[PDB]
C-alpha cells in the first residue's frame, strides 16, 4: 500500500530518473530471474520498487553497480 512519491523524488531527483529506475527495477523483479530486497507485504512490483527507492536501498548508481557486477 502506497499513497505518494514525495520521499522518492526527494531521494532521486528530477522525478523522471525515478520513473525509469523504478521501471527497470520492477522489470527485473517481475520477470522470474531476480528476487526482491525489501520484504514484500502483498504489494506489486511497481510499489515494491518505489518502496526500495524511497527507503534508499537502490538508485540508478546502485542499479548499474549491481548490473555490472553480473
Amino acid at each position: 500500500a502506497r499513497v505518494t512519491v514525495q520521499d522518492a523524488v526527494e531521494k532521486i531527483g528530477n522525478r523522471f530518473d525515478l520513473v525509469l529506475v523504478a521501471a527497470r527495477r520492477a522489470r527485473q523483479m517481475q520477470v522470474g530471474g531476480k528476487d526482491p530486497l525489501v520484504p514484500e507485504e502483498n504489494d506489486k512490483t511497481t510499489v515494491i520498487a518505489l518502496r526500495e527507492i524511497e527507503e534508499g536501498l537502490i538508485n540508478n548508481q546502485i542499479l548499474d553497480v549491481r548490473e555490472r557486477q553480473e
Binding site: 502506497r2 502483498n42 504489494d43 506489486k44 511497481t46 510499489v47
Partner: protein, 49 residues
Amino acid sequence: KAAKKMVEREEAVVWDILDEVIREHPVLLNRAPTLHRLGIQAFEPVLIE
C-alpha cells in the same frame, strides 16, 4: 479458451483474481473537455457494485 469461457460465465473465483489485480494498478480518469493537464488524473480503482 477455457479462461475466456469462465470469465464470460462470470464464475465466483474470478472476483478474487480481479481484486488481486486491482490492488496496485492505477487507472486514468479523464473528462471530455480536458482543457488543462489536470483533466487526466490517475486514481487507484476500488471495485463498486
